[PDB]
Amino acid sequence: TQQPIVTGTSVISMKYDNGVIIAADNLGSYGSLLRFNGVERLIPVGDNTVVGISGDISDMQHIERLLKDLVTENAYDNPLADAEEALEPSYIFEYLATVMYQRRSKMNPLWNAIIVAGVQSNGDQFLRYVNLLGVTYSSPTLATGFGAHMANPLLRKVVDRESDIPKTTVQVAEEAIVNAMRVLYYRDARSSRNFSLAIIDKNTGLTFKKNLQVENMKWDFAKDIKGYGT
Amino acid sequence: TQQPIVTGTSVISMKYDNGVIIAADNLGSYGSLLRFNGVERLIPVGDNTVVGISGDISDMQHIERLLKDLVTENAYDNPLADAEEALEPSYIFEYLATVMYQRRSKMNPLWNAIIVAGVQSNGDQFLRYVNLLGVTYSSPTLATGFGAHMANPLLRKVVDRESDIPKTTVQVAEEAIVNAMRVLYYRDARSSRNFSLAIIDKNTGLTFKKNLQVENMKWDFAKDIKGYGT
Amino acid sequence: DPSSINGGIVVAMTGKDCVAIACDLRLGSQSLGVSNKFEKIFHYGHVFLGITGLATDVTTLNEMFRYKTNLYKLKEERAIEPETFTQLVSSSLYERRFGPYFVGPVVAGINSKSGKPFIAGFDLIGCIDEAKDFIVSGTASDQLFGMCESLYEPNLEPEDLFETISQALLNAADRDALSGWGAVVYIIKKDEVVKRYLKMRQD
Amino acid sequence: TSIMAVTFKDGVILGADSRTTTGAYIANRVTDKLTRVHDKIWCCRSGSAADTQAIADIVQYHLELYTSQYGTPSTETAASVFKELCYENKDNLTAGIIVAGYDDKNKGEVYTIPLGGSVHKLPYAIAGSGSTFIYGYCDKNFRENMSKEETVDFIKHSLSQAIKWDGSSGGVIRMVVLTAAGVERLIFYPDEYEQL
Amino acid sequence: TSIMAVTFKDGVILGADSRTTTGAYIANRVTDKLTRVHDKIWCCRSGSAADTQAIADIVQYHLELYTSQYGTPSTETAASVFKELCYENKDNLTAGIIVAGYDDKNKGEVYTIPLGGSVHKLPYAIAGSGSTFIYGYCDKNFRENMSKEETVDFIKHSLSQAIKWDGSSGGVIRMVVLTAAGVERLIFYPDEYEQL
Amino acid sequence: TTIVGVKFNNGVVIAADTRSTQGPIVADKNCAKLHRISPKIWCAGAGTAADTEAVTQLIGSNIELHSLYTSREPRVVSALQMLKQHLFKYQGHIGAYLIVAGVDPTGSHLFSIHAHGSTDVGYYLSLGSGSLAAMAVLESHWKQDLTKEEAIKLASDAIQAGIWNDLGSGSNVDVCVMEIGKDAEYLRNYLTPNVREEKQKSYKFPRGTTAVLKESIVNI
Amino acid sequence: PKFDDEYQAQARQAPLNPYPGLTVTEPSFANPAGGYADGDLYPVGTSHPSQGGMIFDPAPRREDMPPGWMPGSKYDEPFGP
Amino acid sequence: PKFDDEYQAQARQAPLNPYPGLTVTEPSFANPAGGYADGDLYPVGTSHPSQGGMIFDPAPRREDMPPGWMPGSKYDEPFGP
Amino acid sequence: TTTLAFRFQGGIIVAVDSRATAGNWVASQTVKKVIEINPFLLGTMAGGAADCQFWETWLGSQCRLHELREKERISVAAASKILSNLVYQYKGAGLSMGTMICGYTRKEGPTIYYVDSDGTRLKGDIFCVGSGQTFAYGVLDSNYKWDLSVEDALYLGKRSILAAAHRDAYSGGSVNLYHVTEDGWIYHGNHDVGELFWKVKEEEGSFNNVIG
Amino acid sequence: FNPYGDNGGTILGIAGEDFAVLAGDTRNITDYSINSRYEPKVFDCGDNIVMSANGFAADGDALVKRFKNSVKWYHFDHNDKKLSINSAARNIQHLLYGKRFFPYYVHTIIAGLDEDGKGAVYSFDPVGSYEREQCRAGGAAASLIMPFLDNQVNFKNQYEPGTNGKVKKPLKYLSVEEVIKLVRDSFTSATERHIQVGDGLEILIVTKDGVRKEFYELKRD
């Protein structure tokens, strides 16, 4: 991919006391044309992992196929694959990061930014970022595209350091994610009203709330503007 | 003006035994968007002159205003202006050519190609071409844009040299012009079904047939084509 | 410009039953004239090949066609005919389509069986240009075209053919900056070949 | 941007979206793109914001002076001033403008001035990056002498589609209704025109 | 270009314009852009003609081999092959393709592969430079499970507007009706679809 | 170059002019532009002349080999397929634009091929710098089920329009008529409207006009 | 809005070598652009510190010509205008 | 399809003088065009015949910075990324 | 172009070729490359024909105004300074000039001033200008002497232009010679290279590499 | 914005004793399209002078109009006196060099009889630089036309037979009719080998009896 053509704008996620929350809108934009509205950019890879992908949609589908093949190959000659020696979030993220870096070094990058979120089998939350250049990092809150600027401050207000993770409950994190998605809808031209949200909890497993709606929009103040200047 | 934004494609004209016939489509195109279909690009400037203009539509309207001002200022302190010392086609063309060349020299060109067609008071047909560069020439048949390539051969098949003008009657020339419009509509992507036609005759004066339709289209052979190759 | 760096001229004409091929002798590098004896006319048996363009490619193709025509002569037991040589040259030039030699070659000769004069020209990449009257190549291509068109007429005798081709080359070279320093004219017949060096301006 | 003007039986309705963007960022989501150049003459800004605002202020100056010296201008006078200013500076300027107004002798009139600086009267006009997506809808749905409610619904549907498809268009749909009765501001919020 | 596939109650109707431009010149005004890649699978071509035709021939080869070795392919198999060819050569290729087909289990299916090389199932798809002008119309007029005649009229109106507004689209409107009964070629001439 | 193809009631007729120009200079006045791909498959090309010659020669050799292999008359679509695959392989760098017309057991065919490998079916086609002038006549006068005589007249007159109205096209008209039931008729210089103006004087010089430094006899 | 050239017949082509094949005219060879520490080797910082005649008169660049064009080869425009 | 930039916020500014005001670095003065007959005036046609040391470290281009940017001046991005 | 001018006991010898070229096409072979400012002042044009011809014709009018006002001839230094200043004020505008202002004045003796597009002005005893200047230098510097006889100086100038005409593609045509004397300038005629070359080869025996 | 073009025309001036001939084709061109078959580009300028401004057509028209204005003003001032060929040459030089840095891309030729009654041809470059010539071709087909005219009118590279290249052929005068024949043949060759020439040949003859115009057909393909 020398240039992206059809793109998904942003993915936002954060870790809370017992798991991680990840969300992304369902809109793939062809330039400024909001062309495709039914795109799913949260890719579950198990009961303990969800992969959020941004950037080129074709490369996103290629990466999704890679993840399906990862699971299929893991299942081979692995009688324990369903309970232990299953694919941890760390293995998925490391494979994806290796692939991304190899593509970058070959001057044929996958034009995506990927957030792999989940919980390790020992219960420790996993949340890492990787982009087309192979740059990877971890943080209590991660975001992509305009989320890295618009949404990420709002999430950081909730958990500004590792010490705040145990203090953060499911409801607080989910409300923060929904408010951040609403703000992104307000200010991001590439964003959409519909978005998917996935919650991976060390106790209750993966919950995947698809096609949610941005709600409680504030527009009634717009009536009091009558032009520029006078 | 450095680039044409909204443009009228082509104008064609030919001289017959008693006058000149000129036609132009009514479509102004914004790039490949056939945006404005009601544009009039034949500009009568008297009972003996009509000016056809191509290229930028805004510059065409500017030139039309210039012609209106010419007509207005010719009548000042000119008690004979309505029958002799009236504006000949030659005067209109010479003023337009001077203006066009001057604009060219100042590196601020009018992106138009102008065909001034008419009959002099002595009855001699006038038909000359001038473009943005100031290049001028006369011929029994003139065309602009794709007309210079598509239509002009068709008109030349009728009047190939000055010796053929007296042999060409009104009906023959009008049929040639209408066939040229049909061909240009077939093969010119910027062209339109609707076109205006003006006839200046040394005897019967200016006839101005507006909003004519392209007729007798041939499409019924298209049903047999089965794509590329097989 | 590789095709104009060294200059040089080649012109071929057909008589009634003879051909004449002539060339200028200047070799240079733009302004500076280097040598006055760079002969651009080569012969492989009874077929003559004149090559204008980058001098390195002229020498390289002279060597290549010497090799190929010698192998043809040996394994065929017969000299390569002008038509077959034209096809060979065209095929060899196109083999370098994307890396082409910067040369305008000009073939001239008489077919040994039919005795019919034959001439042909090419572009950098082997587009065969066969003509029945005359062929032209080099930096003075247009001057030579006009001069030959004005002077040439069909069925010239060898003497009148010599005069016509020599005058065309002389007057064409006198109007080309990168051409001159003498010329050589070959008058080719079914039984003999006459080589002549022309006196001309040395500037 | 998604500008639109539609003449109807009792006048002309001028409408626009409220989203302004700098690239992918929505720098202003409630902006008002309709400008009152005169009492019954309103223009809509498209293209460069700076050029359009400068042209609007110059035209307001010229039309105020015209009103003081020669009486009330018509929509045509306003659009002519727009045309001269845009054309004499067409190389520097990058503004396309729709001019709509109501005068009793002519009722509602609409002129559109595309980027080239030409003048066109039209029964209705659509401008902006979002207009490209509603050319077909507006062409097949426009009718002469619509009623006020029919025109409002038509503009609502057209701008709804333009907002749906264009990432550079969005926010509240604002309209100004020019009629003999007066000028009426209308505003329609996303939950109102998106559920059509 | 203006190509358009629309699923309906009995199957899918695929349609396109017949104009091919090279610059402003119309190098071919009666070209047929609908291509039969299999018995009940018809792709349609947008973008570079060379790229699209090469992809079509490669897909025909692959799907013929698939039919001979593994049984009849579905529309999904055909579009998947289009996906692999377009994506693994996306730097060289510039083709955007619509794949429409009829399967007894799935009935009519439509997949669109935009220039980027992704796959999307849609109830209806529009592509080509002329489709931009009918995004609003098709969105506001499409319905699930239309009848055959309703779908034909819908495609006719949509491509009529696309041809009206796009200079690079025109000529006759050809359609292929994929249904259990078979495949039906339809053709509508300018005097028919332009007077709608 | 002005090339046209015209399908008619029982075959196809392809015609071209003969002027060949390098830059603004007429290198050859009577260049033959119609090339055999087979006895009943003929083509004429534009763009890079050398590439057109090389590709048509290659395709003709391969097609004759395949005809001998299969013991069948070549199909026009076979030539189309092979030619466009070869053109595509180089991504347009061979720059050959062609109109290929022929007759085969499946009927009379007329195609065009572009340098990048795209092809089109057609009833009448034009190519070269004179493509628009010839296409104007073809649009104005083409009809369904032309007779052979009308087809030849129409193609010849379109080529004449290109000759008269285009600088890069002139001299004579070549025509080749392929008909379903019988052999192709190649009409070299079918029309010869551009005859040569006579010299005002014969400019032959008296023998001895040129100055010669050396004379020699060459052992060839 | 562009005009959707389907055949790529209007398709036109580091800067292109004006004379393909000859590497002596390749931009990367005519102007190699030195090395990362050339400024430390040579005190200056650099290792290395027209055809128009007497009478004024009014070839194409490959970058502005179709890919199939070869400078100095016989070329015929497939459609011209 | 490009996005709208109504404010021209992302609008970016012959080649540009790297350091405005100084004519000694002006492209038309640093590399003046030769005379139309310089080929006839001089034999070969021509009137005439780095940074970073041993350590590999890894300024803006005035042609892609906004018009208001002055090379070397203090500038704060108005809208951020 | 090739032009040369060298001072010697008998005055100045000015020699120039005649060829003018536009690319490979030789436009003309009879271009007069000496502009005759006044009966004692002589310009030698090279480079761009239009610039040199026009501006030295204008220099002639300036000279005429000078005699009319001050009743004494413009000095060679003064005329060359006027031309140098003028050409300098159009530096970077595209002027193409190479000029030797050769003249004789009672209070200056024989004098040559080299002037060119880039504003330079050089007083000197020998100058060669034009594309063929190096070839002319090769002969002048190897054969020049101050006390050459008038016939020998004329022949030296003719031979020096002939060498450059032979070796330089843009320097053919014919050799025009001028002798700037104490009482004016003497035009010693035009010599066509196509005959001068053979005459010189026969008489000197030089050009032994040239066939003939 | 490129403000220049090339309309593909050729002009030819030939001078001799008793006459001067200025011939040029009537073809007008833009790229590969024929604009008109008959657009004269050699003009009878009055005062027994003939002018042509071949090259870029718009600049040719502009320069011709400017020269007409200048010569008319010369008539206004100098009591309607006849303008000489050298005076016209200097006037055109000053017109051309007045736009040194935005030149008229036209190769001008003026032909006529000088003050001694002998034929004269002056030729200009786009910047000025007029040289009086015995013959001078110009335009698109100058390179085709001119070498043949050298060979025939001046007998360059021609030597008396039997002298073995030592005695040149003497340069005897060509009569006006012979010059017409040479011009016709040269333009026929230029038409036949150059695509921009072949519509029509117009010749203006200047002699003490006055200007005389003759027209001849060319191939026009």
Curated annotation (Swiss-Prot), chain C:
Record note on quaternary structure = The 26S proteasome consists of a 20S proteasome core and two 19S regulatory subunits. The 20S proteasome core is composed of 28 subunits that are arranged in four stacked rings, resulting in a barrel-shaped structure. The two end rings are each formed by seven alpha subunits, and the two central rings are each formed by seven beta subunits. The catalytic chamber with the active sites is on the inside of the barrel.
* The name this protein goes by in its record: Proteasome subunit beta type-3
Query: What are the protein's GO molecular function terms?
Result: endopeptidase activator activity
Q: Which UniProt keywords apply?
A: Cytoplasm, Isopeptide bond, Nucleus, Phosphoprotein, Proteasome, Ubl conjugation
Among Pfam families, the record links this protein to: Proteasome (PF00227)
Keyword Zinc on entry: no
| Record-level GO BP terms | proteasomal ubiquitin-independent protein catabolic process; proteasome-mediated ubiquitin-dependent protein catabolic process
- Naturally occurring in which organism (per UniProt): Saccharomyces cerevisiae (strain ATCC 204508 / S288c) (Baker's yeast)
Q: Where is the signal peptide?
A: none
From Swiss-Prot, chains G, H:
Q: Where is the composition biased (Basic and acidic residues)?
A: 58-65
The entry assigns this protein to a family as follows: Belongs to the proteasome inhibitor PI31 family.
Subunit text:
Interacts with the 20S proteasome.
Q: Give any extra note attached to this record.
A: Present with 358 molecules/cell in log phase SD medium.
Annotated function: Plays a role in the establishment of transcriptional silencing boundaries, preventing the propagation of heterochromatic silencing.
Q: What is this protein called?
A: Silencing boundary-establishment protein FUB1
List the lineage, top down: Eukaryota, Fungi, Dikarya, Ascomycota, Saccharomycotina
Q: Which residues of the full protein are shown?
A: 127 to 229 of 250
Curated annotation (Swiss-Prot), chain I:
Task: Name any one GO molecular function.
Answer: threonine-type endopeptidase activity
Task: Name the source's superkingdom.
Answer: Eukaryota
Q: Where in the cell is it found?
A: Cytoplasm; Nucleus
Which keywords does this chain's UniProt record carry?
A: Cytoplasm, Hydrolase, Nucleus, Protease, Proteasome, Threonine protease, Zymogen
User: What's its EC?
Assistant: 3.4.25.1
Active site residues per record? T1
Name the catalysed reactions: Cleavage of peptide bonds with very broad specificity
Q: What is its main location?
A: cytoplasm
From the UniProt record, give one GO term of the biological process aspect: proteasome-mediated ubiquitin-dependent protein catabolic process
GO CC list: cytosol; nucleus; peroxisome; proteasome complex; proteasome core complex, beta-subunit complex
Q: Which family does it belong to?
A: Belongs to the peptidase T1B family.
Q: How does the annotation summarize its subunit structure? A: The 26S proteasome consists of a 20S proteasome core and two 19S regulatory subunits. The 20S proteasome core is composed of 28 subunits that are arranged in four stacked rings, resulting in a barrel-shaped structure. The two end rings are each formed by seven alpha subunits, and the two central rings are each formed by seven beta subunits. The catalytic chamber with the active sites is on the inside of the barrel.
Q: What else is known?
A: The side chain of Thr-1 acts as a nucleophile, and the N-terminal amino group acts as a proton acceptor.
Its name, as the record gives it, is Proteasome subunit beta type-5
From Swiss-Prot, chain J:
- Where is this gene product found? Cytoplasm; Nucleus
Q: Which organism is it from?
A: Saccharomyces cerevisiae (strain ATCC 204508 / S288c)
Subunit-level organization: The 26S proteasome consists of a 20S proteasome core and two 19S regulatory subunits. The 20S proteasome core is composed of 28 subunits that are arranged in four stacked rings, resulting in a barrel-shaped structure. The two end rings are each formed by seven alpha subunits, and the two central rings are each formed by seven beta subunits. The catalytic chamber with the active sites is on the inside of the barrel.
The name this protein goes by in its record: Proteasome subunit beta type-6
Q: Which InterPro entries does this chain map to? A: Ntn_hydrolases_N, Proteasome_bsu_CS, Proteasome_sua/b, Proteasome_suB-type
Keyword DNA damage present in the record's keywords: the answer is no
- Which GO biological process annotations does it have? proteasomal ubiquitin-independent protein catabolic process; proteasome-mediated ubiquitin-dependent protein catabolic process
The main place the protein resides is: cytoplasm
Q: Briefly, what is this protein's role?
A: Non-catalytic component of the proteasome which degrades poly-ubiquitinated proteins in the cytoplasm and in the nucleus. It is essential for the regulated turnover of proteins and for the removal of misfolded proteins. The proteasome is a multicatalytic proteinase complex that is characterized by its ability to cleave peptides with Arg, Phe, Tyr, Leu, and Glu adjacent to the leaving group at neutral or slightly basic pH. It has an ATP-dependent proteolytic activity.
Specify the domain of life of the species encoding this protein.
Eukaryota
Keyword presence, Transcription regulation:
no
> Which protein family is named in the record?
Belongs to the peptidase T1B family.
